[PDB]
Ligand binder design. Structure first.
Ligand SMILES: *[C@@H]1O[C@H](CO)[C@@H](O[C@@H]2O[C@H](CO)[C@@H](O)[C@H](O)[C@H]2NC(C)=O)[C@H](O)[C@H]1NC(C)=O
Ligand SMILES: *[C@@H]1O[C@H](CO)[C@@H](O)[C@H](O)[C@H]1NC(C)=O
Length: 173
RNA sequence: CCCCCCCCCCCCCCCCCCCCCCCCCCCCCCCCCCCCCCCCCCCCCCCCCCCCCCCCCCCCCCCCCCCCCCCCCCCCCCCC
């Protein structure tokens, strides 16, 4: 796992997050591994991560406290996992996120408000899920959102109310 | 009891590209052989023509000699 300013762990057969890395590491790439979970305790040492690419692993669920240990996290990639369920507290503490990638997670539906808390989010990706609607919330949030990816889902119609949460959003894509 | 999503490794097949290796064809150059045409040099051959030399033949010319025939002239002697 060679790392001078960015840490990469691609195809390293890793099952748990390594605990021997420089403290000032800002980028942690853990793609194509066997990470079952991402406990917050394993990320206590890393308090300066900006981008955490954990996609192409076997994560089934996360914990909100993980975002507590990463106050400066900007890019969070959860591509190709099985996080089929989300909660309103899942992304509450991740208030400085810019990119949130959730492609190919077999998510079936969005319940109440998983993205209300974050306000600086720029792009939200939800492609290759089982979503049958564009409903992502109830109130108006995602003020600064510019890109919304909803490709390869089960959406069959577009309704005005389902998009009402983007009243103050200038969707560039 | 039953699905789906990731990881490594092993493959199979179809394309692309790069390697050596070889084949066939072609090009460039050189060499060799053969054929055709042409030039140059030297030694000759045959024929024709011109000239020259030697020898010979025939004819003719000039001169000379010999013989024959013919003519003229001189001496001398007889006959009637
Ligand atoms: C973390 O590393 C992975 C693997 O290198 C990156 O994912 C993809 O890697 C493949 C193979 O090198 C590339 O062909 C893709 O282009 C990469 N994806 C993208 C979106 O470029 C992954 O991007 C890395 N993550 C970060 C945050 O750098
Ligand atoms: C955000 O949306 C609300 C409700 O529509 C509106 O009152 C408010 O003016 C919007 N904000 C901006 C900056 O336009």
């Amino acid at each position: 796992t060679v790392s001078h300013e960015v840490a990469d762990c691609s195809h390293l057969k890793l099952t748990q997050v390594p605990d021997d890395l420089p403290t000032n590491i800002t980028v942690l790439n853990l793609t194509h591994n066997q990470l079952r979970r991402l406990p917050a305790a394993n990320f206590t040492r890393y308090s300066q991560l900006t981008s955490l690419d954990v996609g192409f692993n076997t994560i089934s669920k996360l914990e909100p406290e993980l975002c507590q240990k990463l106050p400066m996290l900007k890019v969070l990639n959860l591509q190709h996992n099985e996080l089929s369920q989300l909660s309103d507290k899942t992304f509450a503490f991740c208030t400085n996120l810019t990119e949130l990638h959730l492609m190919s997670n077999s998510i079936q539906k969005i319940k109440n408000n998983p993205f209300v808390k974050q306000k600086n989010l720029i792009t939200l990706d939800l492609s290759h899920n089982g979503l049958s609607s564009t409903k992502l919330g109830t109130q108006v949030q995602l003020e600064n959102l510019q890109e919304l990816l909803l490709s390869n889902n089960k959406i069959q119609a577009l309704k005005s109310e389902e998009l009402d949460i983007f009243a103050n959003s200038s969707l560039k894509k």
